[PDB]
Design an enzyme around this catalytic site. Structure first.
Site, PDB file in Angstrom:
ATOM      1  N   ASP A  70      20.726  41.803 121.108  1.00 37.20           N
ATOM      2  CA  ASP A  70      21.071  41.463 119.698  1.00 37.20           C
ATOM      3  C   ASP A  70      22.203  42.373 119.229  1.00 37.20           C
ATOM      4  O   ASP A  70      22.086  43.593 119.354  1.00 37.20           O
ATOM      5  CB  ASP A  70      19.934  41.654 118.701  1.00 37.20           C
ATOM      6  CG  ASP A  70      18.642  40.929 119.010  1.00 37.20           C
ATOM      7  OD1 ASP A  70      18.546  40.310 120.106  1.00 37.20           O
ATOM      8  OD2 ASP A  70      17.724  41.014 118.153  1.00 37.20           O
ATOM      9  N   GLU A 334      13.806  33.679 113.784  1.00 33.67           N
ATOM     10  CA  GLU A 334      14.335  35.060 113.939  1.00 33.67           C
ATOM     11  C   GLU A 334      15.773  35.119 113.419  1.00 33.67           C
ATOM     12  O   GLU A 334      16.395  34.049 113.224  1.00 33.67           O
ATOM     13  CB  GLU A 334      14.301  35.555 115.394  1.00 33.67           C
ATOM     14  CG  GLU A 334      13.114  35.095 116.232  1.00 33.67           C
ATOM     15  CD  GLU A 334      12.999  35.856 117.551  1.00 33.67           C
ATOM     16  OE1 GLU A 334      13.187  35.250 118.607  1.00 33.67           O
ATOM     17  OE2 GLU A 334      12.734  37.073 117.512  1.00 33.67           O
TER      18      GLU A 334
END
Length: 478
Positions: A70, A334
């Site tokens: 990420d 998410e």
């Protein structure tokens, strides 16, 4: 064969009001309705316009010493990506590939790192790997874990959020601190603790390098309440993370934050309603509510939360009602982000094939919804389905796993994850699995054309849709 999708108005509500848009089973069942049985030797079932192009299996590592997943840019609250003193700057979740643990055991070891590169260089003139120079860990050792106080724990991690360029500090990092108390088998001795936190520091640069000072003082901002957002006590497997801090020009005095949560229910509660199913009482392809709950769909309870700053310093925050739920549809929504285009509000959120409720199916990738406000009867994009961009997937064969690919499945069904939508519809992501090879490297940057209630992946961009590996460009100098 397939149900009528739940209609949605997109109408805006007061951000403080009790209204939650539903990503309904009737909506989500549109994804497979829109699918085609792949024609051998093709292994993709998704509409071409909603399919991420095949990433080359010979992709470079972002850095050979670091697993990277990420990733977020240096930004402001408008969402602009900033160069500082003629450098591009990104922040990544970081782990050590040669430290004992395997790639799928990354998560409890996660440290926020930063990378930098000279600005104003077209991607195709940079090194193939994107030319990111690794600066190391962003936070001093032991600074983040102070947020948990004196609690039993075996690991702590720094998970995703945002960097806001703004006390001669000039960078506020909003992220999720997580604490684990696990036996050697990965079993929870106590529930994980997840606290959305803030650390401020100072970015500095000369002609040779970028570096940071500060981030000594970590401020806990939000933990789940068990009223809107599910706690460890309700569900040891609860999700609470991924703060996206932003300004809504519809509300000029306020600072807001969207984040991943779960519907605040005790695990195993028979909590789904007709509104989560979303059928006309006359739809011949409607489902029975009890039958849906008996199938085990009650274990999939995703929501996107909203919080608002309560002081001018943004050091105190308050929960607002959730803006989207996926109860009995998917357990994971998410890295939610609010993307403003043509006066409309796009909610982008990432989800997984393997976290879908029984009787509902869709790929790993980006999901999208459009409305008139940050709290809307959000319209799922692309035929009221919610799919924006999926990894190439055969939804008519089993999902398998990134650590054990089903041979009957597309070997790129897990090729990318944690897709982040950048100015002008460029999409930045990391590589998880391409056949036998695990990534921990940035994916080629990609481009979606966002047009009202639908999206097209731009196959004119870069090489047949694929731009540069880890191409996260600044649009404005800081």
């Amino acid at each position: 064969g397939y149900p009528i999708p739940t209609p949605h108005s997109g109408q805006a509500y007061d951000p403080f009001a009790d209204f939650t848009a539903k990503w309904t089973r009737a909506n989500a069942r549109q994804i497979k309705a829109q699918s085609h049985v792949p024609v051998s030797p093709d292994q993709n079932s998704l509409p071409l316009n909603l399919t991420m192009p095949d990433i080359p299996a010979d992709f470079p590592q972002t850095n050979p010493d670091v697993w990277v997943w990420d990733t977020w840019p240096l930004a402001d609250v408008h969402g602009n990506q900033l160069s500082f003193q003629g450098w591009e700057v990104i922040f990544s979740l970081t782990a050590d590939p040669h430290a004992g643990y395997v790639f799928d055991d990354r998560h409890v070891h996660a440290r926020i790192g930063f990378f930098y590169r000279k600005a104003g260089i077209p991607a195709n003139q940079r090194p193939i790997d994107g030319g990111w120079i690794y600066g190391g860990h962003l936070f001093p050792d032991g600074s983040s874990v102070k947020v948990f106080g004196n609690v039993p724990m075996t690991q702590n991690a720094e998970w995703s959020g945002g960097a806001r360029f703004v006390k001669n500090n000039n960078v506020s990092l909003y992220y999720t601190a997580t604490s684990f108390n696990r036996n050697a088998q990965g079993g929870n001795i106590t529930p994980p603790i997840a606290i959305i936190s803030r650390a401020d520091g100072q970015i500095q640069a000369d002609d040779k390098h970028v570096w940071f000072t500060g981030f000594d003082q970590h401020l806990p901002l939000l933990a789940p309440d068990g009223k809107y957002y599910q706690t460890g006590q309700q569900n040891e497997f609860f999700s609470f993370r991924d703060p996206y801090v932003f300004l809504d020009p519809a509300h000029p005095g306020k600072t807001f934050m969207v984040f991943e949560g779960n519907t605040a229910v005790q695990r195993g509660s028979r909590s789904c309603t007709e509104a989560d199913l979303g059928y006309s009482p006359n739809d011949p392809n409607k489902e029975d509510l009890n039958a849906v709950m008996d199938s085990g769909a009650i274990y999939q309870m995703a929501n996107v939360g909203l919080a608002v700053a309560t002081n001018d310093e943004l050091t105190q925050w308050k929960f607002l009602p959730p803006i989207l739920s996926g109860n009995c549809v998917n357990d994971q929504t998410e890295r939610p982000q609010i993307y403003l285009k043509d006066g409309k509000y796009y909610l982008f959120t990432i989800s997984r094939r393997t976290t879908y409720a029984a009787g509902v199916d869709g790929p790993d990738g980006v999901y999208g919804f459009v409305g008139d406000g940050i709290r809307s009867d959000f319209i799922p994009l692309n035929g009221l389905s919610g799919l924006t961009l999926g990894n190439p997937t055969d939804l008519y064969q089993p999902a398998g796993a990134p650590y054990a690919l089903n041979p009957n499945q597309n070997p790129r069904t897990f090729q990318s994850y944690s897709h982040y939508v950048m100015p002008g519809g460029l999409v930045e992501s990391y590589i998880d699995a391409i056949g036998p090879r695990r990534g921990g490297a940035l994916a080629p940057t990609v481009k979606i054309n966002i047009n009202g209630t639908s999206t097209i992946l731009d196959r004119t961009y870069g090489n047949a849709g694929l731009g540069g590996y880890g191409d996260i460009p600044a649009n404005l100098p800081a």
